[PDB]
Design an enzyme around this catalytic site. Sequence first.
Site, PDB file in Angstrom:
ATOM      1  N   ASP A   1       8.741   3.417   0.902  1.00 25.11           N
ATOM      2  CA  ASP A   1       7.917   5.299   1.478  1.00 25.11           C
ATOM      3  C   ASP A   1       7.678   5.862   2.740  1.00 25.11           C
ATOM      4  OD1 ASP A   1       5.038   3.728   2.430  1.00 25.11           O
ATOM      5  OD2 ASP A   1       6.041   2.411   0.851  1.00 25.11           O
TER       6      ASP A   1
ATOM      7  N   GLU B   1      10.499  -8.547  -2.516  1.00 25.20           N
ATOM      8  CA  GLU B   1      11.271  -9.848  -1.085  1.00 25.20           C
ATOM      9  C   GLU B   1      11.645 -10.477  -1.003  1.00 25.20           C
ATOM     10  OE1 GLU B   1       7.631  -8.097   0.113  1.00 25.20           O
ATOM     11  OE2 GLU B   1       7.621  -5.967   0.706  1.00 25.20           O
TER      12      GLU B   1
HETATM   13  C1  LIG Z   1       1.521  -3.445  -2.529  1.00 26.29           C
HETATM   14  S1  LIG Z   1       0.637  -3.152  -1.139  1.00 26.29           S
HETATM   15  C2  LIG Z   1       1.922  -3.592   0.020  1.00 26.29           C
HETATM   16  C3  LIG Z   1       2.945  -4.500   0.131  1.00 26.29           C
HETATM   17  N1  LIG Z   1       3.961  -3.952   1.095  1.00 26.29           N
HETATM   18  C4  LIG Z   1       4.099  -3.375   2.426  1.00 26.29           C
HETATM   19  C5  LIG Z   1       3.869  -1.581   3.005  1.00 26.29           C
HETATM   20  C6  LIG Z   1       5.436  -1.320   2.062  1.00 26.29           C
HETATM   21  N2  LIG Z   1       4.916   0.212   2.789  1.00 26.29           N
HETATM   22  C7  LIG Z   1       3.718   0.098   2.874  1.00 26.29           C
HETATM   23  C8  LIG Z   1       3.660  -1.068   3.323  1.00 26.29           C
HETATM   24  N3  LIG Z   1       2.075  -1.234   3.930  1.00 26.29           N
HETATM   25  C9  LIG Z   1       0.933  -0.272   4.219  1.00 26.29           C
HETATM   26  N4  LIG Z   1       1.418   0.593   3.911  1.00 26.29           N
HETATM   27  C10 LIG Z   1       2.640   1.212   3.392  1.00 26.29           C
HETATM   28  N5  LIG Z   1       3.107   2.541   3.339  1.00 26.29           N
HETATM   29  C11 LIG Z   1       3.071  -4.568   3.018  1.00 26.29           C
HETATM   30  O1  LIG Z   1       3.611  -5.542   4.011  1.00 26.29           O
HETATM   31  C12 LIG Z   1       2.399  -5.039   1.521  1.00 26.29           C
HETATM   32  O2  LIG Z   1       2.720  -6.633   1.480  1.00 26.29           O
END
Ligand SMILES: CSC[C@H]1N[C@@H](c2c[nH]c3c2N=CNC3N)[C@H](O)[C@@H]1O
Lengths: 230, 230
Positions: free
Chosen positions: A197, A12
């Site tokens: 996601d 990022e």
């Molecule tokens: C590996 S923990 C996920 C990281 N990416 C972001 C994220 C992406 N997708 C999700 C994140 N965090 C919580 N739920 C999700 N579905 C968050 O801010 C963390 O820095």
Amino acid sequence: MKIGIIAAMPEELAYLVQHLDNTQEQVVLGNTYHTGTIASHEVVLVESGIGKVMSAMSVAILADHFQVDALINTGSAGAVAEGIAVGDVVIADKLAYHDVDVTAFGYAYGQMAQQPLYFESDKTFVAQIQESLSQLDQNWHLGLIATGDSFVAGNDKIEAIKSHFPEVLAVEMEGAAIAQAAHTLNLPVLVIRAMSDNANHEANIFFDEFIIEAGRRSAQVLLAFLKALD
Amino acid sequence: MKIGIIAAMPEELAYLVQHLDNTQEQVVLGNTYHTGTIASHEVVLVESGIGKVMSAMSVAILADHFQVDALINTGSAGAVAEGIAVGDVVIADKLAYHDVDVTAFGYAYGQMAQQPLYFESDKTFVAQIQESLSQLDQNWHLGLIATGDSFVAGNDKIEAIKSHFPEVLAVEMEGAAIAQAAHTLNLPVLVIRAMSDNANHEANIFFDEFIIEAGRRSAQVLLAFLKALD
Ligand SMILES: CSC[C@H]1N[C@@H](c2c[nH]c3c2N=CNC3N)[C@H](O)[C@@H]1O
Ligand SMILES: CSC[C@H]1N[C@@H](c2c[nH]c3c2N=CNC3N)[C@H](O)[C@@H]1O
């Protein structure tokens, strides 16, 4: 002004580092801080690490060690509002915690003790970033991003979060933390996230697959914003 | 060594400030830091504010601005293990988050991404503090303190926490955060908490009633410890 820019993971921050002028790297308390300018704007880039604590620490150091005047967070998040697609970018006009319960004392659900329920991104930053985006482009969104120290990966948790914040667009793990820290320092903040996601049962798989693209897309929007900020 | 001492609320720092030798107050980033000594030990006292983010920021500033060599947290907590009474003191030999779920990636419940499940208080600190306490005194305890960004006030949540950490003795909102931050800085840590309530339906009432006493008791144990640490 001097802008502190925080990203939780390397994927990022990479794009921004590649577009940093007069780049210089300083090691402070075991972490690398990238100083330089972006579109003639003085900045300090840092990969904080994941979660509330790590991101909060980066804010504190950016303020104490580099005397930043503002804070901007960029990265990935899980799409929760119906219709938001993987790859879309969400600009947070407001942030709140979806995993905080201090209601026994009368606080609203999600509201941390001694803190407001919602943390608001700087009105000027929000106004200007929208101006840099096209109204015809349906892939960017302006709204609420809810934060928690958990990776949301199930419709059950999505539904639980929505029961408290029905207008939530996306969820992540540092947004409101950085906004809370910024609020404590009386510093303007802005949070931008690209969807990696759908925060459902398949979230870990989509995250692994799209973190590089999401990190880049969020950063591209930030770069476009900084070039127009002036 | 230079010890940074963090308390979430004023009630939990008052006693220490009153017993700080060569005391001096300094304002850094809008918060007061008390410098001085306690039994040949240079220290820096600070009221961080409640929660993961506020306490994490305090750790970062203590390290970056005052170059502390160790961190100790003192304050109140909710008693959850059967038999622990209000007013009892719990020394945390280990700390963990009870509200962290990143299990979708394979982490154990409570384990933050890029972090260990348990954060351990310095073995030397733990060994020495036990030496300063009487084995005949049944009001102090050594064990696990679980942390979360929520005020636990219901047997339902207590049971939920115990399902993940059956050996939990008490719960609070800054312990593991401070331990995580300390771990990130490779600094030894110790967490001490006095029970202000039973973390049940009446927790808010007991907290209001016992915060002054709990803050004092926890600080008394820390002071005794520092006077014997050397
Ligand atoms: C590996 S923990 C996920 C990281 N990416 C972001 C994220 C992406 N997708 C999700 C994140 N965090 C919580 N739920 C999700 N579905 C968050 O801010 C963390 O820095
Ligand atoms: C007013 S929020 C409670 C504060 N006191 C501690 C506390 C006492 N009793 C409880 C606390 N935290 C969570 N659940 C409890 N039952 C926490 O660490 C916060 O700093």
